[PDB]
């Protein structure tokens, strides 16, 4: 009977149960302090004594080695170089001979990610942000280029006094079109992927699966009539008033209806039904619709100006979507 | 069995909103030591005869195939997990089955605990408390 | 700045239960538009550049 | 605590083995989550579901998302590990309060002669609800996650406090203590 | 019953926008392949 068995019988006296969670707590516990490159904050890596996972005294070979990592530091450290691509290709092939996996980052002509970097993954995101924006402005410029007559694709009745309001929509019309693409550009690349437009892209490229978070309604893949929408404040600061992209089906004028299901007051209204909402929408076909108050709205096809590499498109989806059930 | 090397639970029972405590001890453990020496042995004899016969025969056509359909990562995985910390002259396999079915068949008789009392209360409480008398029949 | 329309206005009676060929209307706020301000986006103080 | 136990049972399927892997138990802090765009109050409302996938260094496809287990503690996480508390007796182990967070063990992509590629990325996901605004994704590098060396050294002195705390706690409880406990106190004091 | 004025909703009705002259040339509508942000 070691001292440990008495400790193991110390609890079983005051416990009334083994409680395996405690049994490892009575053993050795390895606490390694770490830091998070993203938040600069701390997260504690732990490996128990009997833990089968890494750091545990019971573990299966082979274990993790620094062989790839340690060399990569001194490869350009002995060269006093910041980057392995500024390393001479003689030493670059030197580690390749030992390490056949380094071909991918080193020998790939057009790596979808900047090899041997940290923020390279972020650069992957931000360029897609830009890629989506120009797919609008060029397409926005397209339909609006020569001064058009939009008429209205929706159906609303106007009072005699409401006409004076619509007169204000004229003057107020161009300033908003700036402010949209202003904020749309200004959005954080992360949060942008929750917007109704980024979902249409993740839906459209998937059409060429289920985009993650199930934001897409099940019938959004039925007809090109099923849409998604966001709203924007008409007066004062122009902002995005809708967390959840709103799904509406349309059917010249045709009526509209919501779909099946905390509260967003913006959801009791149809697009362009009331003042102080700029109503923006897209499709599975990714034919855009821009709906201003009063129901006056025009189509935009942004699929034409959207340009992306398939190896990028398929790589983006697998991160942002899921294999369909 | 745990005293032959417990949990903080397993000593507390719930019936009809009432709590019990089986701890409430070492005299009781020696009072019950012979059952532990039979409940352990009837299992360790049992699981080995399962383990030393199915790879020994797997007698084939549809008998072993329906057995393997039941052993599709269920019994054979439990075999390969136990035979990892195990092994695979004349072994008295067929003679030990009679010795096992007689012994393990006996413990089912002892731990059966047959009901004699069937309570049909009439003009009374549907739940009879502790210390009270209950109307009891053993007849239809 | 008045938007174009073919028609001026009409006067029609509509019963509640007998409504057939349904339609919808447009909403304007209850405060005078002098309190409905022009749209503004503040360009941030500096650019990522 | 239990989130690491339950996950190792999953890592016991050796996965595939054809592609060798490893597992690293990680305790995220709360302030690391707060800066990550994580509302803390939403988690509090006992495991929690998390999707993970591994992402290649330069070119390739990401692993398909797979569900892992997470348990969030709005208290000292390292303290719960270090000084477990008997539900009946809290005063048995005094300890310093700290902050904490969810527990998730993370997969590590190995090789034959397992060596991790640094700058390769492992990813979490946190769903407060169906919609993506309730979903966040955090990234980590095998450099970030894998420390070069562990420490079991500092934990040694800790255990002797327990042998002292038990021997100290029983001495206070005195006659009320169950006999088996007073017994162990004798030997454990002899080990002191 | 109920009474209100009435104007037919018609696709023949439209609200004429008028853009500024430099409106089409902006750092917004015109973006390079890679920006500084």
From TrEMBL, chain C:
Protein name listed in UniProt: DNA packaging tegument protein
Organism: Human herpesvirus 2
Lineage of the organism: Viruses, Duplodnaviria, Heunggongvirae, Peploviricota, Herviviricetes
Superkingdom to which the source organism belongs: Viruses
From TrEMBL, chain D:
The organism's place on the tree of life at top rank: Viruses
Name listed for the protein in its UniProt record: UL17
Source organism of this protein record: Human herpesvirus 2 (HHV-2)
